[PDB]
Amino acid sequence: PQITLWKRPLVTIKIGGQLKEALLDTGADDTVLEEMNLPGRWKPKMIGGIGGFIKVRQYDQILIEICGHKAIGTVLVGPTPVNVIGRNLLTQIGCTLNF
Amino acid sequence: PQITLWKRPLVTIKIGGQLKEALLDTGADDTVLEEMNLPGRWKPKMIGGIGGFIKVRQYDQILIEICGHKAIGTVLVGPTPVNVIGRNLLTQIGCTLNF
Ligand SMILES: CCOP(=O)(COc1ccc(C[C@H](NC(=O)O[C@H]2CO[C@H]3OCC[C@H]32)[C@H](O)CN(C[C@@H](C)CC)S(=O)(=O)c2ccc3ncsc3c2)cc1)OCC
């Protein structure tokens, strides 16, 4: 589909058998999701933006479904105020910016 | 143009007569630029990001040219990690997400 930017570009995603709302975010290098108890091994990481850094758990090779499109890659989990889908997954669903 | 997301969507902008690099960011509601001198009145404002809140200078009705496309709108100036073009100006240049 084509998503205009009058409102936050929020979409439903499916991760770990759960449905969540996430922002399609071209400014996010990586995908960051609100705290959730994913199984598997993980590595600590810190990611920074406006206001400083937060501590997150980095999980690799996680499958996510974004509006029916399937994607698999690194997901960071942590105390983020919003779920963000980042470039690492947006590239996989064929997402582009057009103006 | 159609911009893919394998690399950061960095573009040249023209603001206050000076060229700069900025990231097109569909997860940003607002446009936030690193510290710089901007002609005009401004009011103090706060904006919240992943890491908390920061103090910025809010400049209203600023002319900015983004890959040749003209926008006129609010620009926030403060300690952001990178210059970001937010939805308030992306909508002006007719930007959409497509996948
Ligand atoms: C209801 C809202 O609650 P809130 O007010 C704010 O919540 C939020 C709303 C949206 C976003 C997404 C973020 N946008 C943003 O910061 O936009 C601000 C400017 O425009 C305003 O609108 C939105 C907020 C205001 C950017 O898109 C992405 N970022 C990087 C960017 C800043 C360039 C370095 S990233 O998220 O830091 C991030 C993600 C993955 C990653 N991998 C490695 S680094 C790394 C960094 C974050 C928080 O809570 C305050 C405590």
Side-chain angles (χ1 to χ4, degrees), chain A residues 1-6 8-20 22-33 35-40 42 44-54 56-99, chain B residues 1-6 8-13 15-17 19-40 42 44 46-54 56-64 66-99:
Chain A
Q2 171 173 293
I3 300 171
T4 60
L5 304 175
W6 293 116
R8 298 129 317 281
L10 294 172
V11 298
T12 297
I13 66 174
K14 162 158 73 153
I15 173 173
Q18 285 191 312
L19 298 194
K20 316 190 108 82
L23 180 64
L24 299 184
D25 187 352
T26 59
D29 290 341
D30 300 304
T31 299
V32 192
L33 300 181
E35 283 261 10
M36 61 172 323
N37 200 1
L38 281 181
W42 55 270
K45 196 190 207 122
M46 268 167 91
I47 59 171
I50 287 168
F53 283 74
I54 61 152
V56 302
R57 304 195 301 288
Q58 173 186 333
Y59 296 83
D60 283 354
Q61 285 303 93
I62 302 295
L63 172 62
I64 286 173
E65 224 200 5
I66 308 165
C67 283
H69 295 57
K70 278 187 211 346
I72 185 167
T74 298
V75 173
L76 311 175
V77 178
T80 173
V82 48
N83 292 318
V84 174
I85 306 302
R87 291 189 296 101
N88 72 307
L89 301 183
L90 294 171
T91 54
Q92 295 189 23
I93 64 171
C95 188
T96 63
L97 276 177
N98 296 83
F99 66 90
Chain B
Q2 178 168 260
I3 298 170
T4 52
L5 301 170
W6 304 98
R8 291 193 227 150
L10 294 172
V11 309
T12 304
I13 63 170
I15 177 171
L19 299 176
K20 295 175 166 273
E21 212 139 63
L23 185 72
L24 309 182
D25 189 357
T26 64
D29 297 346
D30 307 325
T31 294
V32 193
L33 304 180
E34 283 170 322
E35 203 47 74
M36 55 170 313
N37 297 291
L38 249 179
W42 61 267
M46 314 273 310
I47 60 153
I50 196 164
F53 279 81
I54 63 167
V56 297
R57 319 209 299 281
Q58 177 173 342
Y59 295 83
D60 283 337
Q61 245 172 290
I62 297 297
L63 284 70
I64 167 161
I66 304 164
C67 280
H69 294 63
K70 287 233 208 110
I72 310 179
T74 298
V75 170
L76 313 177
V77 176
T80 175
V82 53
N83 299 322
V84 296
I85 307 304
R87 290 187 300 101
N88 71 311
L89 300 183
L90 296 174
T91 55
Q92 294 198 18
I93 61 171
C95 200
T96 62
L97 285 166
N98 303 266
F99 62 95

